[PDB]
Write a protein that binds this ligand. Structure first.
Ligand code: ZN
Ligand code: ZN
Lengths: 197, 197
């Protein structure tokens, strides 16, 4: 079949997302052909990322320290909080280079097979950050999904009673998109949200 | 090479957009194999569409009559005009099923190799429709292009001095899009345009 070990690697690698049995092989071999120092590194890396991983006690983003890097920054507005459902969403948001607020990851909002060793949702703490802080606005940056919606709504409900300006990220036509082509839904929301001048 | 006629058809067909030399052949043969009545139809069709074509004297959309079907409808708000740069944009807009205004195609806004037998731009008439009508709003439904912009702007300028509410179609994240994935620009506009609650 396959050298019992090489067999093994293929299995591990295949368990990965988007990594199919074919591309699995190609990689097993590259790896195996790689230089033992290079190989070690790929290996330390994979394991140390798992144990070291931790979740900011302030915003619940992924990070390696007790409190995340954004949070403990100082050069950033801790009075605008950008709400988000999944930690990658921050890395998306964060390549914007023109946002200066902090964030809040609601976790178990996306709870597919969640609670993986104890992954639970964080709405309560979002409130207490607002209920007990001095927050100006709360930007909901969640999916135009029918799932991204209803979060945006719900949460706008829990926050409305406070003094905060709750706002949602804009839905419509992507920069460099063509309405000639766009989805009707899309372009249908694109209508609903037309803004003066 | 190719039966001189079959040769010919391939040439004509290839002149078409997105129709490449290979797919050209496949079609030539299907066609040629098609039933002479079916073939005639494809043929009448192609030519009659060209001559019959005409441009609504009211909104400058493509149509076969002297004035377009929307325009002469009655069941539609002729006081909301949806501005657009290219007649397909209307067919996009029009599958929305929740717009009840009329439109205006600015033509030579998209003037690539325009003036094809006399295709010229229609901004002036957009004004006179407003300057001499009773129009409530003017929805600019143009591309998040850097080209779609500047139209939206310019035209909002020409109309501002009137009483009209000028509004632009919304830019951001497509319905069923994922900001985890979206373009930075996109998602960067998606920020700029955040709307309360
Ligand atoms: Zn943090
Ligand atoms: Zn018309």
């Amino acid at each position: 079949y396959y050298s019992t070990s090489v067999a093994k690697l293929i299995e591990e690698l295949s368990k990965l997302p988007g990594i199919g049995p074919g591309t699995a092989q190609r990689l097993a071999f590259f790896i195996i052909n790689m230089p033992l120092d290079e190989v070690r590194s790929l290996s330390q890396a994979i394991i140390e990322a798992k144990e070291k991983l931790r979740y900011c006690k302030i915003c619940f983003n992924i990070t390696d320290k007790e409190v995340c890097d954004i949070c403990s920054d100082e050069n950033r507005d801790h009075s605008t909080i950008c709400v988000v459902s999944h930690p990658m969403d921050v890395v998306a948001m964060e390549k914007v280079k023109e946002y200066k607020g902090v964030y809040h990851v609601l976790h178990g909002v996306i709870s597919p097979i969640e609670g993986v060793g104890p992954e639970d949702i964080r709405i309560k703490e979002l409130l207490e950050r607002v209920r007990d802080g001095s927050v100006k606005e709360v930007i909901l940056a969640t999916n135009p999904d029918i799932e991204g919606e209803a979060t945006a709504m719900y949460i706008a409900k829990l926050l409305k009673p406070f003094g905060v300006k709750v706002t949602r990220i804009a839905h419509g036509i992507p920069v460099g998109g063509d309405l000639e082509y766009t989805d009707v839904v899309t372009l249908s929301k694109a209508l609903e949200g037309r803004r003066e001048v």
